Design a protein around this ligand. Structure first.
Ligand SMILES: COc1ccccc1[C@H](C)CN1C[C@@H](C(N)=O)CC1=O
Ligand SMILES: [Zn+2]
Length: 140
């Protein structure tokens, strides 16, 4: 589990969104596994606006933050899970790292801020849903 709290937005994995998230919806995209809802309190996370390919992510199944090298956001094939059939997921970045289903939502960050959140995994790989292109998270 986990979310990004930026301004009056809460960014979560679409497959982990709650009823309150759907009842306060700002934007969602199944192809990216992302959903954004509105918040009453202001958040403290800042979004990175960069093309970094190195950073650090949080892994809840190890209680550890790991430094990783990750691919550029792309259209990647992801195997069937409890939440989606086997399909192409867009704006996804891959790295070598430990992940389990419940690790979704962990933040990936670089020197500029939050890059994205854990969205996929298995077999020593971890995939992150990028958020750096969502410029509207910084305003309104
Ligand atoms: C942390 O990711 C791991 C790790 C190990 C095994 C499996 C997974 C994830 C949770 C499987 N998936 C892919 C997700 C998606 N974004 O399509 C939806 C889903 O259930
Ligand atoms: Zn960066």
């Amino acid at each position: 589990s986990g979310a990004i709290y930026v301004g009056n937005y809460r960014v979560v994995n679409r497959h982990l969104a709650t009823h309150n998230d759907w009842a306060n919806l700002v934007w969602e995209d199944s192809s990216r596994d992302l959903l954004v809802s509105s918040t009453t309190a202001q958040g403290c996370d800042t979004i990175a606006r960069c093309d970094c390919q190195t950073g650090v992510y949080y892994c809840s199944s190890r209680r550890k933050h790991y430094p990783v090298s990750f691919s550029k956001p792309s259209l990647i094939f992801v195997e069937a899970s409890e939440y989606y059939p086997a399909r192409y997921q867009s704006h996804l970045m891959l790295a070598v790292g430990h992940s389990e289903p419940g690790d979704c939502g962990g933040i990936l960050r670089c020197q500029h801020g939050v890059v994205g959140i854990v969205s996929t995994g298995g077999n020593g790989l971890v995939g992150f849903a990028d958020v750096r292109d969502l410029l509207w998270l910084d305003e309104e």
